[PDB]
Design a protein around this nucleic acid. Structure first.
Ligand SMILES: Nc1ncnc2c1ncn2[C@@H]1O[C@H](COP(=O)(O)O)[C@@H](O)[C@H]1O
Ligand SMILES: [Ca+2]
Ligand SMILES: [Mn+2]
Ligand SMILES: [Mn+2]
Lengths: 627, 616, 612
DNA sequence: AATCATAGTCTACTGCTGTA
DNA sequence: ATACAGCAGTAGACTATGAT
């Protein structure tokens, strides 16, 4: 279920859309290329300068030298982790398509996990249904994949404009940097002109989106390759701009996210010295030097051995250069067993709280590096003690020991099992994931992250999102419990500083811690006419009813408003209008036929909505039916 | 003298004459021109037309065969049969069936030159085509010269399949596959167009179906055709295709255990060598599974050697002679590390001394049947299958059910949607009935068939006026045998809600016919992304008749009241099985009530936020 | 009268010439007239095709140019080899060098003479080392005019040809001019068989249509040649053989007449017309069969007889690897149900009853599984499009000739395949050309057919002196090129087949006095160029000095210091030269020769040419 | 700074089957 | 028959190199 419409999201959509006021879409003379390439969206330097200044002013962004640049087609959007930046850039793609008919976009991602997560979301039925209702558009997705002439590129370049389809190329950094894109082929694309993938993509005149712009440093290779596309405009989205801004259009910070409770609060748990450095294979211990691959002891460090030497590579994937250390007390059996036991006890305290309420299915995520029978024991014990859906859920948890479960293929399997994990039909709630797979977790119902054999904002962000109820809908104030080592004591102080530093000021004292109107009053009076008697009236629900006995009668009410507001395809206009106001296609057409005006744009539709709503309030017959 | 001139043209310019000895005027003209971009491509006149045809939107609606679907057998059926143009039918499936199909099997018209294939469609003026396709007026004139008139060339054939294969690709799951039957007429041309639509990297392989026995005098005796196989994504495609329930394998495990229960020591092998010596000839490909013990029948796998090149050289010690065993000519295929593991596992068969190369103990129960590229299966059995369904003579060159049965078993593994958009006689659908009633098997079939009239012929003389009628009947009969599995019928309908683009009384709609109302609900549910198998439940909202389907609620009927709205909010509050997230209503039958529905869907509590959509 | 071999050509030069020469009506002072050619087509009752399709590739116009280009090499003899007792009287040829250049030299003497072609071209798998390589060095400006394409298009093509590429366009640019020439060498009834795999089957088919025309497509064979047990989706176990012809002139049917034992059994089947009743016909035949049994290989299991001839029993009744049709068969004598096959029957009940009517079913003495009657008269009765022949025997054939080498050649074709194709397509006569020799399988097959089957074929095989892979079996044994290995294979295969031998020829670089080798090179080149077969003897003539040569009534005077001129005038018999070719680099003595020969040509004509 | 990606080479192996 | 060596074999692990 896609959340519409979140104010912090709609604000970012509008902030990119406002940059293109008075922009003109210029079609090519070439009849063949017109069907495959994008229209050239041209607008003057002054126009573009003025459009940005007005956006910055409205959004409360300082019109400084570091925040704007009229000699740059790069537009910037800043949104913190767990605020829906992906949904926002996708909704903007649909808006640039609605207003200008831009139908070909390149989504540039820096990682395979972000590529897998972006594609999953783009292909999902809930997204498809959401955007087909609101725009009467279909998105065709072309994913550039390493084969272990790229088909995604051929198909994206070759795809026809002829009108319900938006075409989108999803590509990662590794593929942008591959020779596969620079090479010459026997095959020609774009009216048989280009034998190179980059020349074929450049000719499409694309609009490029950059996900996490801090992973594309402007002076470096990846960015220089993106420059080769001679893109119309580049829209960068992220929480980190380590090289500053180009044209900052929107900023939703980490303090705003935590403060306006758009994200879960944090409840940190610190579970309670030595260092084994890699010398030259000789390893120095400070709590004596040992030689060398076999199991590392050297202490009690459980379950860890050397795999490669030159740098030394450990059994969990930890690569040590000559000088790199590791605290051997991190791998202690008692310390983990303790961390795991504590998270289980805290989960059931939250489980009986959420599953006895509509119900919310909570999840606990454990992060392993590479004892296991204990977990079951602990769950079983806490279940038999705590003995009504959670009574039957505990009964199934006792009757079975499948309450727990466990690189590009592995992330895909996580994303696949997503709807399954949130289903109250299956008992699985505890998840064991290797640290290397962390990038593939962003599950709203994860209420506990437990780093077992271990930016703080990035790691908490995996469980920051607002959870969904049994009816798969976001709850309309929860907290994520985070479990850390004895090694991390400054955790809440270092995270509270990190959130503040990233962002007159804030941040909430409670969030991250250790565990016109006169018309409205007349209407409220119309319905109205210890536990107190006033409580019984203030809690009795009713439903609005409009007393208009004829469509011919309604027609005259909308006509009056239309004439009073004289100071301001046609088919696509009326369809978009009906869906917003809501009034009959025939009655809107009838008034417009009578009226001495002439249509047709999104600005006109937005004025009729805002205007007619006010008119409706200011005037008068209406009611309230007892519901 | 005129024939002598023609012979010079054929002798020096053979490519200028088609397969039927007809003159290709343009091929000689392009030779005559030596004036001043060359690229790797299969090009044909109509490629731009085929590209248009695939992007052109549906001009129709979909509706059920209410009589057929309400029958007990067909009721909750997972199987579909659709009437209409397959291209139009596939375009309606996109919102619900992309990408959900595990396998596509199609038997398109071959371009035999004796099958009556001719390109023809519904659809333009040279002015009209030139604008939409985005090509010069001379090309739009040249295309229409063939699309409107009778054409059976490679280009006409490619214009016909391209949009069908293009849309079908969209319905395919990433791990999904397409299978296409053809003969020598269009094999290369289809294979080249599949390279275009799917990518050459996604070619799985081609199968050779040796299906005929031709004893009539000729140069080459043509006794085969092909099955081209492609995947949507070669990367997401399962690495291996194997059957674990072979008929030969199952027989041997049964015979193995039967002998094992009746005989003990050295007698077990003597009794087995007796039955083996006599039956060996029927055991292929397990005709060398001569050995037996208490764990079953096994073979000595003489599969330790290295293919083609130099391998691993080391000593394998004989357990009795204690000398190194004879080494294969190319050395071993296993590294010592793997060999040592096979020795500890007791997988090695040694000779009576070291002068014998080692073997691997492999049991018949562990046999997995692969898909060999050359299939020998007489196609003439399709007449026997059809005389058993229709005991009338000759109703349809139909495919036998014994061919697609194995391909469905390999591609799919007991589960998945099987799609045939050139149904023919209904062979694929029938094959799903036979496969399902041996299970762990529950595939769902979707087959499409055009309402093309029956020729005078046997079908016409029996009351079957269209190929669809014979197809529907064949599935009814095939369902009756095969335990009444049933299937649902759907058909394309004219778009009654359409109007010519105008603006001045334009929106002044006719009251919906009870049939029209049902056509809308069916089309809307599919368009909205719900599978044709998902049920549409009737909902009562204070007397008002609504419909619920996959989280979305439909309000088509007029006269929706304030009581209906209160009952809707009550049903959300009270009923545990009532959880909609989207409300769709018919505009023409709804402004004051239209606004009332919106305000109520925001003001009221539950705790679900319901979206409100307007349609027509 | 004055010629310098070998003249500039383009991608349509020869094509555009044939049209003007044969249709002057259709050419205006100016370009072509479409209406005039269209008028000639409509007149001969020829319809206008609606066909409009093509496979375009990068290097198409380049390939078209190389097809038209004249040779850029000379031809020599390997006289050391061709003077050996066994090889001197031979009619078989083995040529060293690039096939395209060898085929271009052959055009003049062999045009419309080849009865059959078999070739095993590179399959272009991702591991056969195939790349496009030319040994041509055109300027982009030269290609632009010759092609004719623009300078940028011309630059793109040379970048591609030197890259070198393994693509479909690379492979097509390579194959096109080789098949284009080979087609000119083939008789009107002549056939081409081409081995290929999945990699280039579609591309091969379409380029053969562009070269021969689709109407001249005979068909395609599948050679199911191996077993593959590697875990995959499809277990690929076959290969292809695309067959074309030069079709209106082709024999209606192909039948193999290689088996004397079949003909014997056909004769003996009929012969036994004297005996009619049974078991009396089976009494008289069994008696004869018990004696002659071993003289019947491979038809020696054909122990039974009936009114229609001699036959064997077939265990092909059961369904292989799969459960079949279950029904009962009642024994005609014991009147009990017959023993059912473990996997049921291959064919339905209705089929079984029809075979039981035609008495094509063999029962035991008991109610023993049934068998099918397979007749000797039917034995190799047709060329089935699916051939089941395990190509592993190529290793056996080669291990026999080369017992010292573990693996002589990488992926060699079996004699058994080539043997079969020749026997159906041909009738014991004609040239059999293989311009992609490799192991030398085609040549070897011709040695075998003429030896055992008493056929009169001539083989012409071409192989490039492509180096042997470093450290390989051939390299270890001293074989520097593939050609040195091919030559040796043919040498050892000749010794095993009654020493029929073969002649060797090799391509030479082109080019202030001559060396003796260079003198032998021009002589060999000129005789072929003039239309004489490489098997036609070049008689040495001594006109006082001299030293002249005569080949098919054409006299050659390459040698310098030609005086002696009166010795040629005196012939006396058998000497009758209608053409005089003499090396131009070896004026008045030349003007006197043309003057004297004109006076000697009455009565009655002897021409003159001054070459290079 | 410590992984994460891509492309390409080449290790490590398939299991039935022709012929002697 | 028993047995060696056949398979214009295949899939995927591992390496170099280079990105952030
Ligand atoms: N509004 C949203 N609701 C639910 N999921 C979302 C929303 N916005 C983003 N996502 C998901 O969170 C993931 C964030 O990945 P990323 O592309 O790095 O920003 C996306 O792949 C989406 O699957
Ligand atoms: Ca093969
Ligand atoms: Mn293309
Ligand atoms: Mn044909």
């Amino acid at each position: 279920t896609l959340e519409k419409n979140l104010p912090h999201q709609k604000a970012g959509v509008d902030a990119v859309m406002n940059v293109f006021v008075s922009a003109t879409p210029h079609l090519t003379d070439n009849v063949a290329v017109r069907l495959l390439a994008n229209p050239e969206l041209k607008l003057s330097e002054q126009q573009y300068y003025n459009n940005i200044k007005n956006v910055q002013a409205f959004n409360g962004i300082a019109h400084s030298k570091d925040n704007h640049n009229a000699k740059s087609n790069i537009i910037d959007v800043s949104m913190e982790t767990g605020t829906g930046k992906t949904y926002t850039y996708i909704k903007t793609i649909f808006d640039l398509n609605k207003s200008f008919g831009i139908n070909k976009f390149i989504i540039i991602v820096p990682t395979l996990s972000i590529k897998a997560g972006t594609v999953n979301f783009l292909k999902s039925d809930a997204l498809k249904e959401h955007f087909r209702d609101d725009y009467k558009r279909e998105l065709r997705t072309y994913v550039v994949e390493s084969q272990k002439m790229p088909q995604a590129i051929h198909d994206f370049v070759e795809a026809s404009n002829f009108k319900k389809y938006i075409h989108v190329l999803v590509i990662n950094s590794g593929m942008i940097n591959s020779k596969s894109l620079t090479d010459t082929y026997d095959t020609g694309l774009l009216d048989n002109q280009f034998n190179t993938p980059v020349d074929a993509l450049r000719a499409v005149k694309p609009f490029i989106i950059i996900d996490e712009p801090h992973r594309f440093p402007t002076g470096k290779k990846t960015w220089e390759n993106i420059e080769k596309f001679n893109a119309q405009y580049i829209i960068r989205y992220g929480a980190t701009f380590s090289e500053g801004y180009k044209n900052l259009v929107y900023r939703l910070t980490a303090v705003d996210a935590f403060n306006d409770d758009l994200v879960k609060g944090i409840d940190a748990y610190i579970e309670d010295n030595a260092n084994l450095k890699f010398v030259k294979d000789g390893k120095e211990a400070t709590f004596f030097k040992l030689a060398k691959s076999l199991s590392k002891t050297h202490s009690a460090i459980h379950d860890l051995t050397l795999d490669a030497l030159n740098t030394a590579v450990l059994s969990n994937g930890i690569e040590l250069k000559i000088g790199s250390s590791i605290n051997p007390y991190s791998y202690d059996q008692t310390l983990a067993d303790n961390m795991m036991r504590k998270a289980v006890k805290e989960h059931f305290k939250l489980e009986k709280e959420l599953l006895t309420q509509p119900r919310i299915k909570p999840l606990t995520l454990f992060f392993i590096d590479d004892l296991k029978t204990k977990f079951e024991e602990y769950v079983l014990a806490e279940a038999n003690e705590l003995l009504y859906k959670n009574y039957l859920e505990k009964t199934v948890t006792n009757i079975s020991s499948v309450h727990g479960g466990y690189i590009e293929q592995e992330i895909n399997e996580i994303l696949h099992d997503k709807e399954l994990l949130l289903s109250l039909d299956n008992p699985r709630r505890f998840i064991f994931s290797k640290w290397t797979l962390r990038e593939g977790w962003d599950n709203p119902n994860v209420f506990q992250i437990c780093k077992l054999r271990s930016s703080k904002l990035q790691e908490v962000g995996r469980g920051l999102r607002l959870p969904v109820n049994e009816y798969m809908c976001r709850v309309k104030n929860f907290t994520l419990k985070y479990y850390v080592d004895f090694t991390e004591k400054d955790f809440v102080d270092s995270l509270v500083k990190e959130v503040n530093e990233s962002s007159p000021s804030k941040f909430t004292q409670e969030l991250k811690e250790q565990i016109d109107n006169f018309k409205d009053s007349d209407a409220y009076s119309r319905l109205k006419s210890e536990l107190k008697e006033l409580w019984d009236l203030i809690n009795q629900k009713a439903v609005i009813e409009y007393k208009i006995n004829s469509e011919s009668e309604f027609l005259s009410i909308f006509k009056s408003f239309m004439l009073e507001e004289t100071e301001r395809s046609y088919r696509e206009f009326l369809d978009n209008l009906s869906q917003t106001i809501f009034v009959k296609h025939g009655t809107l057409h009838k008034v417009f036929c009578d009226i001495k005006d002439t249509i047709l744009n999104i600005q006109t539709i937005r004025k009729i909505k805002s205007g007619f709503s006010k008119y409706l309030l200011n005037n008068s017959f209406s009611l309230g039916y007892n519901l | 003298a005129n024939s002598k001139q023609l012979a010079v043209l054929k002798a020096n310019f053979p490519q200028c004459f088609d397969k039927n000895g007809a003159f290709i005027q343009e091929k000689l003209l392009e030779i005559i021109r030596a004036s001043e971009k060359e690229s790797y491509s299969l090009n044909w006149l109509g490629k731009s037309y085929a590209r248009l045809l695939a992007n052109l939107p549906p001009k129709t609606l979909l509706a059920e065969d209410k009589t057929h679907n309400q029958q007990e057998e067909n009721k909750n059926s997972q199987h579909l049969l659709i009437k209409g143009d397959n291209l139009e039918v596939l375009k309606h499936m996109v919102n619900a069936y992309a990408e959900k199909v595990k396998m596509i099997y199609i038997d398109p018209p071959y371009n035999t030159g004796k099958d009556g294939f001719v390109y023809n469609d519904d659809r333009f003026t040279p002015e009209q085509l030139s604008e939409l396709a985005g090509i010069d007026l001379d090309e739009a004139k040249r295309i229409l010269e063939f699309t409107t008139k009778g054409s059976s060339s490679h280009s006409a054939w490619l214009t016909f399949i391209y949009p069908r294969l293009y849309i079908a690709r969209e319905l395919m799951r990433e791990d999904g596959t397409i299978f296409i039957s053809i003969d020598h007429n269009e094999f290369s041309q289809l294979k080249l167009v599949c390279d275009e639509i799917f990518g050459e990297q996604n070619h799985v392989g081609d199968l050779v179906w040796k299906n005929a026995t031709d004893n009539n005098p000729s140069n080459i005796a043509v006794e085969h055709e092909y099955i081209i196989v492609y995947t949507k994504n070669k990367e997401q495609l399962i690495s291996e295709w194997k059957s674990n329930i072979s008929d030969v394998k199952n027989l041997l495990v049964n015979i193995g255990e039967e002998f094992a229960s009746k005989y003990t020591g050295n007698e077990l092998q003597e009794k087995y060598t007796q039955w083996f010596r006599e039956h060996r000839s029927e055991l292929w490909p397990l005709d060398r599974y001569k050995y037996i013990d208490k764990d079953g029948i096994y073979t000595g796998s003489q599969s330790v050697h290295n293919p083609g090149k130099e391998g691993y050289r080391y000593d394998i010690i004989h357990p009795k002679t204690k000398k190194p065993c004879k080494q294969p000519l190319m050395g071993y295929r296993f590294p010592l590390d793997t060999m040592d593991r096979l020795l500890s596992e007791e997988k090695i068969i040694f000779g009576d001394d070291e002068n014998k190369i080692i073997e691997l103990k492999v049991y018949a129960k562990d046999y997995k049947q692969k898909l060999s590229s050359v299939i020998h299966l007489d196609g003439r059995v399709a007449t026997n299958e059809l005389k058993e369904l229709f005991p009338m003579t000759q109703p349809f060159n139909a495919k036998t059910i014994k061919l697609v049965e194995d391909l469905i078993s390999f591609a799919c593994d007991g589960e998945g949607i099987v799609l045939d958009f050139f149904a023919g006689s209904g062979t694929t659908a029938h094959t799903v009935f036979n496969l399902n009633n041996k299970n762990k098997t529950s595939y769902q079939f979707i087959t499409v068939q055009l309402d093309e009239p029956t020729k005078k012929s046997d079908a016409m003389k029996h009351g079957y006026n269209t190929i669809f009628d014979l197809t529907k009947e064949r599935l009814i009969r095939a369902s009756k045998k095969n335990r009444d599995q049933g299937f649902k019928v759907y058909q394309l309908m004219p778009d009654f809600r359409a109007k010519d683009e105008s603006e001045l009384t334009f929106f002044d709609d006719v009251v919906l016919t009870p049939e029209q109302y049902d056509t809308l609900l069916t089309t809307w549910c599919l368009y909205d992304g719900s599978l044709l198998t998902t049920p549409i439940e009737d909902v009562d909202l204070g007397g008002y008749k609504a419909h619920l389907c996959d989280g979305r609620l439909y309000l088509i009927a007029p006269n929706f009241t304030s009581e209906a709205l209160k009952a809707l909010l009550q049903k959300v509050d009270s009923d545990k099985d009532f959880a909609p997230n989207k409300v769709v209503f018919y505009g023409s039958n709804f402004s004051a009530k239209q606004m009332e529905l919106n305000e109520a869907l925001k003001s009221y509590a539950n705790s679900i936020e319901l979206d409100l959509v307007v349609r027509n």
